[PDB]
UniProtKB/Swiss-Prot annotation:
Enzyme class label: oxidoreductase
Residue positions where Phosphoserine is found in the record: 3
Gene expressing this chain: MB
Sites where the protein binds O2: 64
Protein name: Myoglobin
Binding site residues for heme b: 93
Organism lineage string: Eukaryota, Metazoa, Chordata, Craniata, Vertebrata
Length: 153
C-alpha cells in the first residue's frame, strides 16, 4: 500500500531487528506497558510484573517479545500481500485475546519508539515514514478483519 521504495525502507530497517529480535521485542513490550499500563491487564502471565526492573528480568516477557516481533516480521515481509498471515492473528486477537485496535495503535508506537531509540542513524525521516505507513496498513487490515468477524473497537 506503500511504494516499492517504501517497502524497501521498511525491510531495510527490519533487517536491524532481525539481528536481535528478542531484545527489540523485550524493549517493545516494556515501552508499551509503561506507556499504556492498561495494556498489561490483558496479559495474565505479566500482571505481577510491578516495575521495569521486573519486566526486564522476565524471561517470558522476553520470549513473548520474540514471538510478537517474529510474527510481525513474517507479516512485514509479505509487503502487503499478507491476508494468510493476518487472518489467524485477527482471529486469536479478536476472539480469544480480546485486543481492541487502539491497542494495536499503541504497539505500533512503541515499535517506532524502539527503532528510533535503537537505530537513530538508520531510522531517518524517510524510513520513519515508510514504517509508520506499513504499521498503519497492518492495523487497517486487522481492523477490517475484526469487522468481518463482527467484532469492533
Ligand atoms: C504487532 C502486533 C502483534 C502481533 C504481531 C502479535 C503476535 C502475537 C502472537 C504471534 C501470539 C501467539 C499466537 C496467537 O495467540 O495468536 C500472540 C499472543 C498474544 N497477544 Fe499478541 N500480537 C500483537 C499485539 C498484541 C497486543 C497489542 C496485545 C495486548 C495489549 C496482544 C496480546 C496478546 C496476548 C494476551 C496473547 C496471549 C499471550 C500468551 O501466549 O499467553 N497482542 N500475539
Amino acid at each position: 500500500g506503500l511504494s516499492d521504495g517504501e517497502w524497501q525502507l521498511v525491510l531495510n530497517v527490519w533487517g536491524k531487528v532481525e539481528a536481535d529480535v528478542a531484545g527489540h521485542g523485550q524493549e517493545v513490550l516494556i515501552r508499551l506497558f509503561k506507556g499504556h499500563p492498561e495494556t498489561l491487564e490483558k496479559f495474565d502471565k505479566f500482571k505481577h510484573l510491578k516495575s521495569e526492573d521486573e519486566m526486564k528480568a522476565s524471561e517470558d516477557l522476553k520470549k513473548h517479545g520474540n514471538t510478537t516481533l517474529t510474527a510481525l516480521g513474517g507479516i512485514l515481509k509479505k509487503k502487503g500481500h499478507h491476508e494468510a498471515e493476518l487472518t489467524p492473528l485477527a482471529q486469536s486477537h479478536a476472539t480469544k485475546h480480546k485486543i481492541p485496535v487502539k491497542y494495536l495503535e499503541f504497539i505500533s508506537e512503541a515499535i517506532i519508539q524502539v527503532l528510533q531509540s535503537k537505530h537513530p542513524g538508520d531510522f531517518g525521516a524517510d524510513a520513519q515514514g515508510a514504517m509508520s505507513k506499513a504499521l498503519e496498513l497492518f492495523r487497517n487490515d486487522m481492523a477490517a478483519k475484526y469487522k468481518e468477524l463482527g467484532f469492533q473497537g
